[PDB]
Every structure is written in structure tokens, then in C-alpha cells.
Amino acid sequence: GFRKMAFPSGKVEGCMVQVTCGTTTLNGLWLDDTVYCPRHVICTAEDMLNPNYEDLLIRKSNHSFLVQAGNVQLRVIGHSMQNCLLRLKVDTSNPKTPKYKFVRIQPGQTFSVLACYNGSPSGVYQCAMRPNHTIKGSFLNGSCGSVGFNIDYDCVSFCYMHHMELPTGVHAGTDLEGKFYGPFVDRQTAQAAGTDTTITLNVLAWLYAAVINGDRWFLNRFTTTLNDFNLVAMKYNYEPLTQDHVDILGPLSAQTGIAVLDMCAALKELLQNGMNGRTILGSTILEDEFTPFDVVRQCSGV
Amino acid sequence: GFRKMAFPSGKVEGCMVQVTCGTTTLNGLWLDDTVYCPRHVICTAEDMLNPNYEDLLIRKSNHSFLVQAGNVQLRVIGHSMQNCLLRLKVDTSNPKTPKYKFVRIQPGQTFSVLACYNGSPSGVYQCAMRPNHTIKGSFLNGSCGSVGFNIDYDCVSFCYMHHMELPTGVHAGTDLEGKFYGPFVDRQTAQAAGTDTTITLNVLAWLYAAVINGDRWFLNRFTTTLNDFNLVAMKYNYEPLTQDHVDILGPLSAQTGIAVLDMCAALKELLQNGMNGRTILGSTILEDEFTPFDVVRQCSGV
Numbered sequence: 001g002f003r004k005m006a007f008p009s010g011k012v013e014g015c016m017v018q019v020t021c022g023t024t025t026l027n028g029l030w031l032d033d034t035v036y037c038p039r040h041v042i043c044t045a046e047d048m049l050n051p052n053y054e055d056l057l058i059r060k061s062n063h064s065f066l067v068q069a070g071n072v073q074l075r076v077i078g079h080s081m082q083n084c085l086l087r088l089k090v091d092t093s094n095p096k097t098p099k100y101k102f103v104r105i106q107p108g109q110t111f112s113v114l115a116c117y118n119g120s121p122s123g124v125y126q127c128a129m130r131p132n133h134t135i136k137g138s139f140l141n142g143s144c145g146s147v148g149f150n151i152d153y154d155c156v157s158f159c160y161m162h163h164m165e166l167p168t169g170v171h172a173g174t175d176l177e178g179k180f181y182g183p184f185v186d187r188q189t190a191q192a193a194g195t196d197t198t199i200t201l202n203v204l205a206w207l208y209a210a211v212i213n214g215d216r217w218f219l220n221r222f223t224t225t226l227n228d229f230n231l232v233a234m235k236y237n238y239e240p241l242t243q244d245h246v247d248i249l250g251p252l253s254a255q256t257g258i259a260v261l262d263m264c265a266a267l268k269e270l271l272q273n274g275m276n277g278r279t280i281l282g283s284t285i286l287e288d289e290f291t292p293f294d295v296v297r298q299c300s301g302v
Numbered sequence: 303g304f305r306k307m308a309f310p311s312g313k314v315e316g317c318m319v320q321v322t323c324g325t326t327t328l329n330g331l332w333l334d335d336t337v338y339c340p341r342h343v344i345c346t347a348e349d350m351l352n353p354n355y356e357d358l359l360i361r362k363s364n365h366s367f368l369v370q371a372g373n374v375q376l377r378v379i380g381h382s383m384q385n386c387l388l389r390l391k392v393d394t395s396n397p398k399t400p401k402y403k404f405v406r407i408q409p410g411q412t413f414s415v416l417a418c419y420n421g422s423p424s425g426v427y428q429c430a431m432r433p434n435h436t437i438k439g440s441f442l443n444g445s446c447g448s449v450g451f452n453i454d455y456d457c458v459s460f461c462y463m464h465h466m467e468l469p470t471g472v473h474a475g476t477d478l479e480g481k482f483y484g485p486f487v488d489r490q491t492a493q494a495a496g497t498d499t500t501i502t503l504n505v506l507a508w509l510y511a512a513v514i515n516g517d518r519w520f521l522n523r524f525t526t527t528l529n530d531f532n533l534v535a536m537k538y539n540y541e542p543l544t545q546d547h548v549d550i551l552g553p554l555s556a557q558t559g560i561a562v563l564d565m566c567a568a569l570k571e572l573l574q575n576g577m578n579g580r581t582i583l584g585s586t587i588l589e590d591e592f593t594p595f596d597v598v599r600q601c602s603g604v
């Protein structure tokens with residue numbers, strides 16, 4: 001079976017806390033003696049399209065922030081703003097702080113999101129950073145501050161923090177340094193996701209997965225040139241395939257014995273002839289939220 | 303957005319341990335002073351279709367089992383068999399034992415699976431118990447002993463423990479009392495999943511989700527009688543809808559303002575006219591692994 005798989009969320013669950021100002025409550029990430037939070041937690045019903053966070057923050061003091069690590073309360077003994085996040089220092093170092101680091105991920109990469117509310121984790125699922133810098137998340141009211149992450153052996157690489165929902169229902173956020181992924185800003189102005197694209201690299205990885213899985217109905221005897229493939233990719237709103245992408249697919253190509261431009265050839269057929277009522281792994285859609293790394297991780301065997 | 307969402311896995315991750323006999327290693331669940339394990343961990347290359355677990359176990363002693371809670375080692379000071387599981391008593395009570403209980407779930411219900419290897423959790427995803435008593439999991443070698451579960455407030459309800467892969471690639475296992483879900487047994491005899499069925503109740507819940515989500519292209523002005531619907535359900539290999547199923551859908555029906563047999567009427571149209579190149583929530587398939595409870599949990603708002 002091939003399922004969208006999220007990383008075990010324990011190491012992240014222990015870092016989720018609640019942060020509150022006025023009647024505004026959202027989630028924060030508690031690492032060591034710091035708690036990170038979308039800075040919009042300091043906005044008020046008035047300014048939502050003209051928030052001067054600079055101005056709004058200087059009018060705040062440490063006791064202006066209530067931080068709850070569950071039943072317990074943490075004391076804010078210092079604060080600062082970093083890009084679109086607030087870094088709150090507290091008099092207690094989270095005892096469950098895992099080994100971790102901050103990474104700014106690239107479009108096409110995937111990560112696990114731990115959807116949280118009032119500082120309480122409620123669900124975890126896998127996402128991909130869309131070429132248009134948004135993510136197809138599942139978030140309800142009270143979800144900002146929820147984080148995205150990957151776990152390699154013991155390091156929790158934090159990638160993302162949730163900040164907002166766009167008009168199409170997709171989500172935008174920042175890395176843990178507070179810089180937004182994409183041309184978005186944390187203010188209620190009316191902004192919109194740019195047009196998105198299908199992630200070519202991932203679909204191909206997926207096809208390799210399908211074959212490693214034992215399916216190969218879509219394969220054919222043809223081959224294509226990178227450039228000829230990109231002419232079709234453009235017609236079907238797929239990202240242009242590059243030599244770097246072909247190289248990344250080397251391991252998989254080897255393991256299955258199917259050359260990359262061959263697998264491409266198959267993909268160009270799929271895109272032209274449709275799936276004609278057939279399925280791959282279990283889908284009727286060309287799945288693009290599985291990276292080459294995700295496929296090796298999950299099909300590491302016969 | 304509407305995503306297959308797994309429960310936060312932390313409370314379960316802390317109970318995963320490794321258990322070994324001979325050259326056979328698989329995962330076990332460590333609650334208090336007990337560790338549960340598929341009993342097949344005691345088989346040998348010889349008997350795989352004629353294993354007499356009774357006989358195989360009496361020939362075993364406590365030191366016959368090495369249990370590793372990560373770096374640490376636990377000492378087996380007593381053992382017993384319960385149906386298809388072994389209950390290993392150890393001289394240490396797991397300090398991370400969460401509030402929990404054992405539940406035997408019914409077909410159509412969903413749960414989260416924490417895929418584990420050598421006692422180390424590697425991924426979590428949501429599954430449903432298929433009407434045919436198998437699950438469409440994603441398991442590689444070394445995955446038996448991985449558990450399925452649900453979390454309500456603080457209680458981790460353990461449902462499932464993985465034991466085997468069937469010929470079609472689907473999985474079979476037992477509840478935590480060691481009784482298999484389905485007519486399967488823990489021996490290499492050649493068995494096969496019975497024919498499966500689509501879970502009608504869940505699809506309907508999903509449609510309600512789609513509407514709560516803002517989509518409603520599939521709705522129509524028609525209505526149907528339970529019996530008339532079941533005549534179509536049978537042609538399309540769907541489970542017969544019952545009055546109990548209609549009642550369970552009450553809350554959702556109310557919230558959306560669409561009567562159950564009306565929503566049915568829409569479903570019978572979908573099944574007859576196909577989706578004609580359209581999508582629901584994001585699928586081109588009528589999704590049946592979301593229960594009414596899953597939909598309320600995830601669309602609890604506007």
C-alpha cells in the first residue's frame with residue numbers, strides 16, 4: 001500500500017503551547033526558553049489592514065502575554081519581534097525540547113503539519129509546499145501557530161508556522177524565522193495565491209513508486225527528450241523538468257530499471273491519453289505531493 | 303481543506319518497544335508492566351503453516367525474550383499467551399503509559415496507525431476497517447506489532463495490532479485482546495480477503511462535508527426511498543443503507559439543511575452519471591474512509 005504518511009508527532013506535540021493577548025488566543029512553539037507565535041496575535045478588531053506591528057508591540061509589556069503549557073502557566077520575561085513572529089522569552093526552559101533546527105523549505109518539498117487549537121494538538125497530516133508558496137492544509141479557527149516539520153533520525157526540522165487562509169481556501173505561513181513563504185504579508189489586505197503548477201518531479205517519483213509497488217500498465221516503449229517533454233509539460237500546467245530533476249531521480253531509475261526520460265515518455269502519454277478509467281497505486285489523479293525522498297522512505301523494499 | 307487526518311501520535315510513540323526471539327524481531331506495545339506482541343514472533347523457519355503456538359511457547363522461557371525500550375533493555379519476568387498475542391510481564395512499568403483502554407472496532411470505523419520498525423516509530427496515517435475486515439495499510443518488513451488507535455480527549459483507545467499482509471497487498475491484524483478482525487489466522491496458510499464493499503455511510507458523511515465545505519454541485523431536487531436506494535447500492539457494490547445509518551447522519555443533515563434521503567438521491571445520481579470530469583473536495587472518487595464522526599471533528603465550523 002502507498003499512503004500519504006506523516007512523521008510521528010510526539011517530539012512536536014511537547015512543544016505546543018497556548019499564547020494569549022486581549023481576547024486573541026492562538027498556538028505557539030516552545031523551544032528551550034522561547035515561545036514563537038504569529039505576531040498577529042497582538043492585533044485588535046480595529047487595525048487589520050493597517051497594522052503597524054512596530055507600534056502595536058511597543059504598547060505591550062511582558063505581562064501583556066499569557067502563555068499556557070497546558071495546565072501550567074509560563075511567565076514572559078522579555079519579548080521581541082522577528083519578521084512576522086514574536087519570540088517570547090520565558091522563565092522556564094521546555095523540558096521536552098527535542099533536538100531540532102529551523103529550515104526554510106523549497107517548493108515541492110513535503111512536511112508534516114500538527115494542526116493545533118488552544119495549544120492542544122488535534123491532528124497530523126502530510127502537506128507539500130506548492131510551487132505557488134501556499135499549502136493545501138486543513139485549518140479551522142484557532143489554528144494559527146500550528147507548525148510544519150520533518151524528522152530525520154532525531155532532529156525535528158521545523159519548516160513552517162501557520163498564519164492565514166487565502167480566498168481559495170489555501171494556506172500561507174512563514175518559516176521559523178518569521179519570513180513568509182511566498183509574496184504574502186500578515187495583514188487582512190485582500191491578497192491571492194498566484195496560479196499554481198503541478199509538481200513534475202513528484203509525479204515521476206510517484207510513478208517509480210507505482211512500479212516499485214508492482215504496477216506498470218502506464219509504461220510504454222517510447223522515450224522523449226527533455227525539451228520535447230517540457231513542451232507538453234507547459235500545455236498541461238506542469239513544472240518544466242530540469243537536468244537536476246533527472247539526476248535526483250537516478251536512484252529510483254536504477255532500482256526499477258526504467259530510464260528517467262522513458263518514465264517521462266510514459267508520463268507524457270498519461271497526460272495526453274488520460275488514465276482511461278484506470279488507477280495508479282489507488283488514484284485516478286497523478287499525485288504530486290510525494291517527493292523522491294518520500295518514495296524511497298516508503299518503498300525501501302520489495 | 304479536507305485532509306485524511308491522523309491523531310497526534312505522541313502518547314502511542316512512548317509505548318513502542320522492540321521484542322526479539324531467535325533472529326525474529328518485531329514491535330510490541332508497552333503499557334504499565336506488560337508488553338503485547340504478535341505471537342508469531344516465536345515462529346521458526348520450519349513450521350509456518352503448522353505452528354502450534356502452544357507447543358512453541360512452552361519451549362520458551364522468560365530470558366527467551368529480549369525487550370528493548372530504545373537504548374534500554376527490559377527484563378521479561380513472566381509470559382502468557384492471549385489469543386494471537388503474547389503478554390510479556392516486565393520488571394519495569396512504562397513511565398509514559400497514557401490513560402488508555404482496549405476497543406474492538408467495527409467495520410467502517412477509522413483509526414490512526416503508527417507504522418513502526420525495530421521498535422522505532424516511522425510514520426502515522428489514518429485507515430478504516432474495511433467491511434471485509436482488512437485494512438489498506440502501508441507496511442514494510444518489520445512492521446508487525448505496529449498499533450492502530452483513536453484518542454478522545456486523553457484516552458488512547460487501542461484498536462488494532464498488525465500481524466500480516468494478504469495476497470492482494472491488504473493487511474490483517476487483531477484487537478489488543480489478540481482476536482483477529484475477520485476470518486484470518488496467524489499462520490502462513492494461503493488465505494484471502496473476502497470481497498470488499500464500499501462503506502455507504504462514510505461516503506454520505508463525506509458529501510455532507512463537501513457541502514459544509516461549500517461545494518454542492520452534485521445535489522439535485524430528487525429524493526429516494528431507503529429501499530430504492532439499496533437496489534442501486536447493490537448494483538454498485540455499496541453497503542445497504544439502514545435506518546440506523548440514516549439516524550447517525552441526523553446532526554450533519556440538520557447542520558446543512560439537506561435531508562438524508564435527499565443526499566442519498568444525490569449519491570444515487572453520482573453513482574449512475576459518474577462525476578463527469580468533476581471533483582468533490584478534491585477527489586474524483588467517492589471517498590469512503592471518513593466517518594460521520596470524522597467529518598464533524600474536521601468541519602466543526604463555517
Ligand SMILES: */C(=C\C(=O)OCC)[C@H](C[C@@H]1CCNC1=O)NC(=O)[C@H](CC=C(C)C)CC(=O)[C@@H](NC(=O)c1cc(C)on1)C(C)C
Nearest residue numbers: 026040139140141142143144163164165186187188190191
Ligand atoms: C488563524 C488565527 C488564530 O489562530 O487566532 C484566532 C483565534 C488564522 C488562520 C485561518 C482560520 C480559518 N482557517 C485558517 O487557516 N489566521 C487569520 O485569521 C489571519 C489573521 C490576520 C491578522 C493580521 C490579524 C486572517 C485571515 O486569514 C483572513 N483573510 C485574509 O487576511 C486574506 C483575505 C485575502 C483576500 O487574502 N488574505 C480571514 C479570517 C480568513
Ligand SMILES: */C(=C\C(=O)OCC)[C@H](C[C@@H]1CCNC1=O)NC(=O)[C@H](CC=C(C)C)CC(=O)[C@@H](NC(=O)c1cc(C)on1)C(C)C
Nearest residue numbers: 328342441442443444445446465466467488489490492493
Ligand atoms: C510483519 C512481520 C514482522 O514484523 O517480523 C519480522 C521482522 C509481517 C507483516 C508484513 C511484512 C510486509 N508487509 C506486511 O504487512 N507479518 C508476517 O510476515 C506474517 C508472519 C506469520 C507467521 C505465522 C510467522 C506472514 C505473512 O504476512 C506472509 N503471508 C501470509 O501468511 C499469507 C499468504 C496468504 C495467501 O495469506 N496470508 C508473507 C511474508 C507476506
